[PDB]
Ligand code: HEM
């Protein structure tokens with residue numbers, strides 16, 4: 062069983078070292094907190110939170126970094142290497158990369174103004190990476206609500222609260238124009254924009270992402286508070302201002318009978334959202350972990366120990 066006190070004797074300073082690393086990085090890269098939370102999400106949705114996403118290519122298995130949901134998108138790997146080295150110096154061969162990334166995600170959320178809590182620990186590192194599984198399990202922005210629900214259920218998160226609360230991760234961070242081009246100019250082959258996108262915001266987004274423009278251009282997920290972790294993401298949805306299709310469907314999908322009340326509840330109360338986010342985060346962090354003597358305590362998060 063995972064426990065928040067796992068390193069209280071072997072490495073009581075691990076959380077502080079992780080925090081310091083992120084604080085320093087945030088000065089030159091204000092997007093790193095968001096990037097790190099996303100790395101944890103993409104780690105957990107593929108064979109569980111086992112740091113499999115951190116592994117680089119080998120001649121026997123491909124890296125998950127080349128998955129459709131990670132390639133030219135996932136970032137912050139060098140920052141993880143940095144905190145891992147700092148932690149390895151303070152506590153040799155003690156903290157797994159899987160746990161390190163989990164702590165990094167929580168600290169990132171807190172540093173951005175979100176809730177503060179101690180995450181369950183005791184996870185161990187995978188002996189391989191899963192590219193095919195990553196391509197199959199990571200949800201895409203063009204997924205319908207039923208598809209989003211299916212994706213979460215597939216990895217073990219059955220609750221609509223899991224989906225709505227965790228989607229709150231889009232309260233900060235960046236998104237490439239490529240992922241909303243259809244919503245802006247030709248949605249579902251209708252030759253028209255997505256009707257669930259506020260028309261005033263549509264104009265703004267079209268200006269940032271013109272047709273035939275730079276598809277890699279970045280746009281803020283939350284137009285209200287782009288870098289602050291808060292409940293503004295849900296207020297946006299209520300106004301049809303969710304950035305990607307998967308965001309807005311939580312409020313506008315024909316299948317949103319169960320998610321709409323959750324969106325409203327989180328928009329109406331920061332406390333309600335924060336409580337739900339921590340609850341959902343710990344549930345995601347509990348997805349099929351390797352524990353005890355299973356797996357290893359990876360020394361270099363990019364490669365399996367030898
Ligand atoms: C519900 C399904 C979800 C879908 C389809 C989805 C999709 C996306 C997409 C398309 C991007 C943009 C990537 C890019 O343009 O490079 C992204 C970024 C991001 N996502 Fe999600 N996401 C989902 C759930 C989540 C969850 C559960 C979390 C975390 C709890 C999360 C956290 C983030 C963050 C923080 C960013 C910004 C990362 C950065 O700026 O580096 N996402 N997501």
Ligand SMILES: [Ca+2]
Nearest residue numbers: 104107109113
């Ligand atoms: Ca994983």
Ligand SMILES: [Ca+2]
Nearest residue numbers: 232283286289
């Ligand atoms: Ca925000």
